Ligand binder design. Structure first.
Ligand code: MYA
Ligand code: F65
Length: 411
């Protein structure tokens, strides 16, 4: 049972979700005027705090909270360690709403205890292609297309409650206060991802990873293995050889993205993302914010042929604290972000991703099987991890879709 999620406008079972045939809201239409003006009540020892995510000291406070208390893998080998610079980038895109960055502190000594953040995203979230075919057969095309226009909604991330305050029902209070602040802006849907199963995802995909620095990963994952390399020797030689990469990119035309590339990147990205059921719509300002390179945060390269951008790829950096080990405190991971190929096979493009990442000192490249990420898993030697990413809407009925129909990369 679900004392909190059972009270919310989300599909309550897989079975409920199996039945959904059209996109659209779950709740009663409401108006901003219906929504409480004052913050949701919390106990007298706590206070609401709106950190300024553009202010270095407030960023630092959130940073420490997440560093010590945010997402761990199932075996508690790793905990994300998002950088300060990354936090500022992720939480302050163009037209961001400072009121959507919500924290709780202890009133008496200002100890930071909890956080959640929303940012605006414009998303296509109309009825998916396969359900529209069904609707057309049945003479229900108009009902299936009602919510096809891109919608200005909230993307929620970075929900975190300090370890000392877990399982005290603080997360539901954070979620209700975030909901209220978003609703007060006349927004009624949100999109969110999690590695846990909650009621009820519209899509779910595995994580995949690709070793860039085998010597370091084997030190971390266990002692003297892994299983299928057991017999040789040398298993370490075999492993290094398996994951080895060119030291320079192969694609002539490859260079870092520059601001003048923004219009062309937007055009090729938007044409590609259009082929997916759920996916963002980015303005030029959003393309510039999410894709222009930023030291230690986001890395974006374009293939230019004849002064025209024909392909591009991006990845972003999330270090993880290595919780158990000693030789190594941190794992430097690259995550596949957006890309688009029009002149070369996607595997040839992503190979250059791997080369640049390796060249820049990343230990591993990680991704979810969204977009066309499955198309290069085998040849580029990605292996499935133990993680899954589950995609959810708040207040939006949505038919189940494959993760290959999802084009929103959540940081
Ligand atoms: C229109 C605008 C809408 C905006 C809001 C839309 C909703 C956004 C939703 C948030 C999207 C966030 C996206 C991300 O950032 S996903 C990443 C979440 N963060 C972490 O995993 C960090 C480490 N863990 C923690 O900090 C905590 O354990 C959290 C905070 C996760 C739970 O704290 P705690 O362990 O101390 O528990 P509690 O007693 O306070 O509360 C227990 C209740 O919380 C439900 N629970 C557990 N995990 C999650 C989860 N990941 N999303 C939603 N709900 C979750 C659980 O089913 C139970 O409810 P019910 O089963 O009893 O019913
Ligand atoms: C916290 O976990 C780590 O820091 C982490 C670090 C390293 C990982 N590997 C596993 C294989 C060898 C070592 C390198 C790559 C994984 N693996 S795994 O299979 O890829 C996974 C990835 C991610 C998770 C977390 C669940 C997703 C959390 C959401 C992520 C997106 N938001 C926007 C919301 C939370 C769990 C396992 C994990």
């Amino acid at each position: 049972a679900h004392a909190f999620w059972s009270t919310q406008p989300v599909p309550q079972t897989e079975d409920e979700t199996e039945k959904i045939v059209f996109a659209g809201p779950m709740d009663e239409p409401k108006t901003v005027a219906d929504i409480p003006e004052e913050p949701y009540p919390i106990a007298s020892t706590f206070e609401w705090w709106t950190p300024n995510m553009e202010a270095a000291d407030d960023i630092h406070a959130i940073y420490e909270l997440l560093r010590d208390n945010y997402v761990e893998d199932d075996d508690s080998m790793f905990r994300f360690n998002y950088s300060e610079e990354f936090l500022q980038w992720a939480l302050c895109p163009p037209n961001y709403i400072p009121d959507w960055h919500v924290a709780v502190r202890r009133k008496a000594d200002k100890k930071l205890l909890a956080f959640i953040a929303g940012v605006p995203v414009t998303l296509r979230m109309g009825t998916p292609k396969y359900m529209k075919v069904k609707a057309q057969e049945k003479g229900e095309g108009e009902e299936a297309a009602k919510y096809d226009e891109p919608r200005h909604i909230c993307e929620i991330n970075f929900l975190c409650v300090h370890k000392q305050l877990r399982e005290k029902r603080l997360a539901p209070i954070l979620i209700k206060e975030a909901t209220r602040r978003v609703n007060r802006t006349n927004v009624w849907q949100a999109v969110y991802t999690a590695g846990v199963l909650l009621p009820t995802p519209y899509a779910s995909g595995q994580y995949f990873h690709r070793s860039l620095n085998p010597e370091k990963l084997v030190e971390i994952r266990f002692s003297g293995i892994p299983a299928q390399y057991q017999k040789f020797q040398n298993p370490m030689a075999m492993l290094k050889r398996n994951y080895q990469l060119p030291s320079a990119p192969k694609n002539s035309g490859l260079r870092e993205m520059k601001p003048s590339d923004v219009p062309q990147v937007r055009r090729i990205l938007m044409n590609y993302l259009d082929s997916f059921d759920v996916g963002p719509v980015f303005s030029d300002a959003e393309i510039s914010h999410y894709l222009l390179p930023r030291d230690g945060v986001v890395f974006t390269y374009v293939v230019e042929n004849d002064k025209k951008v024909t392909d591009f790829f991006s990845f972003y950096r999330i270090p993880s604290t290595v919780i158990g080990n000693s030789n190594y405190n941190l794992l430097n991971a690259a995550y596949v972000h957006y890309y688009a190929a029009t002149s070369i096979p996607l595997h040839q493009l992503i190979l250059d991703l791997l080369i640049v990442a390796h060249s820049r000192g990343f230990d591993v490249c990680n991704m979810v099987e969204i977009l066309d990420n499955r198309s290069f898993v085998e040849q580029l030697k990605f292996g499935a991890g133990d993680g899954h990413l589950r995609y959810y809407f708040y207040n939006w009925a949505y038919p189940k879709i494959k993760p290959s129909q999802v084009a929103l990369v959540m940081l």
